[PDB]
Amino acid sequence: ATADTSPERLAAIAKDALGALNDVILKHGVTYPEYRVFKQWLIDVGEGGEWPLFLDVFIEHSVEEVLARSRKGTMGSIEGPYYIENSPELPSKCTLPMREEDEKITPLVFSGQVTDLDGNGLAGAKVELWHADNDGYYSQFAPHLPEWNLRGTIIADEEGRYEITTIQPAPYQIPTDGPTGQFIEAQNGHPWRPAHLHLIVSAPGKESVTTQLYFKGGEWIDSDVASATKPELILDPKTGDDGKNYVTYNFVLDPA
Amino acid sequence: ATADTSPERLAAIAKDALGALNDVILKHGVTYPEYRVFKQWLIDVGEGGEWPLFLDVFIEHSVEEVLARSRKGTMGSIEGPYYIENSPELPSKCTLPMREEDEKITPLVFSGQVTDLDGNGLAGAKVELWHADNDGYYSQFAPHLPEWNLRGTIIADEEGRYEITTIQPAPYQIPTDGPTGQFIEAQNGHPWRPAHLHLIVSAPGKESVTTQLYFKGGEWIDSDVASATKPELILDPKTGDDGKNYVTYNFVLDPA
Numbered sequence: 070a071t072a073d074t075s076p077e078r079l080a081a082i083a084k085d086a087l088g089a090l091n092d093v094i095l096k097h098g099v100t101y102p103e104y105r106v107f108k109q110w111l112i113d114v115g116e117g118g119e120w121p122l123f124l125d126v127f128i129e130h131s132v133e134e135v136l137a138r139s140r141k142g143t144m145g146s147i148e149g150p151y152y153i154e155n156s157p158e159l160p161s162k163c164t165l166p167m168r169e170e171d172e173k174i175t176p177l178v179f180s181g182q183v184t185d186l187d188g189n190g191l192a193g194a195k196v197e198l199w200h201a202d203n204d205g206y207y208s209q210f211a212p213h214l215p216e217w218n219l220r221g222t223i224i225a226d227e228e229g230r231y232e233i234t235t236i237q238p239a240p241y242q243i244p245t246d247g248p249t250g251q252f253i254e255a256q257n258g259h260p261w262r263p264a265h266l267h268l269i270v271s272a273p274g275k276e277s278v279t280t281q282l283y284f285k286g287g288e289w290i291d292s293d294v295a296s297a298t299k300p301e302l303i304l305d306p307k308t309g310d311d312g313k314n315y316v317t318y319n320f321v322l323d324p325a
Numbered sequence: 326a327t328a329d330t331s332p333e334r335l336a337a338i339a340k341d342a343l344g345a346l347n348d349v350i351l352k353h354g355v356t357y358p359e360y361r362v363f364k365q366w367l368i369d370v371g372e373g374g375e376w377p378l379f380l381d382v383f384i385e386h387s388v389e390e391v392l393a394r395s396r397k398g399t400m401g402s403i404e405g406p407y408y409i410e411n412s413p414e415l416p417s418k419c420t421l422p423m424r425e426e427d428e429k430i431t432p433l434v435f436s437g438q439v440t441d442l443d444g445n446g447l448a449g450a451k452v453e454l455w456h457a458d459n460d461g462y463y464s465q466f467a468p469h470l471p472e473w474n475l476r477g478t479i480i481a482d483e484e485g486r487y488e489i490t491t492i493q494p495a496p497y498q499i500p501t502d503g504p505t506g507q508f509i510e511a512q513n514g515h516p517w518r519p520a521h522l523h524l525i526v527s528a529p530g531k532e533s534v535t536t537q538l539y540f541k542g543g544e545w546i547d548s549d550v551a552s553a554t555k556p557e558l559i560l561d562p563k564t565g566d567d568g569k570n571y572v573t574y575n576f577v578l579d580p581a
């Protein structure tokens with residue numbers, strides 16, 4: 070990972086960040102024993118390989134909020150720690166890879182079109198989708214799952230249209246066996262995210278958008294531990310006579 | 326490490342700390358590539374075993390500033406990452422353990438008395454001293470040094486008096502082969518601390534004080550990377566006809 074940040078810019082960010090932390094220490098009268106606990110906890114975060122998790126939960130939403138000021142298209146949201154690049158390509162009408170266990174879940178059929186800011190359909194568009202299964206596990210982050218379970222790269226049609234069948238995601242508990250869970254426990258918080266799909270949508274000459282879609286009335290939608298839920302991203306699927314939930318959501322991309 | 330912090334108190338500290346960081350992100354328009362660099366750097370800090378160092382340099386001064394509000398005795402300062410408990414006891418007039426190489430350095434003879442707030446001499450007092458050698462290394466943090474090089478626990482006399490001979494400390498460069506050095510380099514900072522002694526002074530029924538003593542006119546005294554230098558802690562030793570530097574500094578302890 071590399072960035073184009075000048076020493077002047079880093080100096081000013083660092084001064085603000087450390088002054089802020091130091092101001093919090095002074096405000097609350099943080100004590101030596103608390104300092105010692107905080108030191109050991111930072112150590113434990115690294116030892117438990119929890120930096121991507123902790124930062125994506127507690128910090129990433131503010132970085133997307135920065136990016137969100139520059140964009141007029143579909144609302145973005147955090148990537149979170151579970152994206153995997155180069156998931157297998159699928160045709161514009163498709164079903165995500167899933168297990169026999171996954172076929173017992175109520176289907177979700179997600180339709181729409183990738184467009185530009187004027188509403189024009191984009192050819193060449195791709196929709197990379199990934200999400201957790203009904204047990205709350207992500208493929209490649211749980212030894213029991215096929216590596217592409219509920220992951221795919223959907224190639225949209227000449228109009229940018231897609232129709233994707235998957236399973237209805239359910240709420241995700243963040244890992245709590247570790248330092249991040251310990252942090253949440255210590256302050257009587259809760260370690261839940263609402264049910265969600267993740268997507269990255271792209272197209273020739275377009276700025277990709279990384280976003281998430283949630284479900285109206287879903288639990289935790291108003292208290293997402295990751296502060297990543299936006300009202301614009303809440304879907305309201307309708308159940309068909311076949312018992313499947315149908316929903317249409319279009320993506321609007323800013324130009325690159 | 327353990328603390329007596331309530332979930333209410335942690336919740337409020339956490340909200341302030343994360344809101345502060347998030348406010349800095351928004352203020353400066355921190356970008357995704359910078360977020361990615363910051364994530365990897367946090368990882369590298371843990372992998373390089375640099376948490377105690379980074380926190381003692383950039384954070385500990387604010388925790389001592391909290392403690393400093395409660396105390397009327399000798400000004401305190403940070404402990405830093407190099408204290409070792411149970412260093413060998415020495416009589417109230419003594420020389421710190423040192424090597425043949427160390428005997429080539431101008432001696433420093435440090436005298437004084439441990440007192441209470443009224444100026445009364447305290448019996449039972451101890452002065453634990455440690456500091457770097459002229460090469461800028463600390464014993465137990467450099468494979469080539471005897472483990473108690475320039476470390477000792479001085480037992481003060483029935484009046485709380487001490488006379489301790491050591492070598493004149495010289496400026497300390499923080500380790501820069503690692504993530505902390507990288508941080509400082511990236512913002513054109515400098516990785517130096519002024520020359521200093523560390524001390525922890527204690528006595529029956531007294532609150533110990535952890536402090537540091539610096540040297541008038543010494544380099545970096547006005548730009549300590551650790552922000553740990555206080556004007557009250559700057560010594561002004563005078564050179565004797567024997568070529569040794571002499572200085573008297575008394576310690577005043579708050580009651581426990």
Ligand SMILES: Cc1ccc(O)c(O)c1
Pocket residue numbers: 122125126127147148149150151241243262267295
């Ligand atoms: C921060 C975070 C944690 C868990 C997830 O599943 C996710 O998408 C984001």
Ligand SMILES: Cc1ccc(O)c(O)c1
Pocket residue numbers: 378381382383403404405406407497499518523551
């Ligand atoms: C923060 C820090 C770094 C190096 C030292 O020698 C010290 O005493 C303190």
Ligand SMILES: [Fe+3]
Pocket residue numbers: 149151200201241265267
């Ligand atoms: Fe997720």
Ligand SMILES: [Fe+3]
Pocket residue numbers: 405407456457497521523
């Ligand atoms: Fe030191």
Ligand SMILES: [Mg+2]
Pocket residue numbers: 254257258
């Ligand atoms: Mg609880």
Ligand SMILES: [Mg+2]
Pocket residue numbers: 510513514
């Ligand atoms: Mg430089």
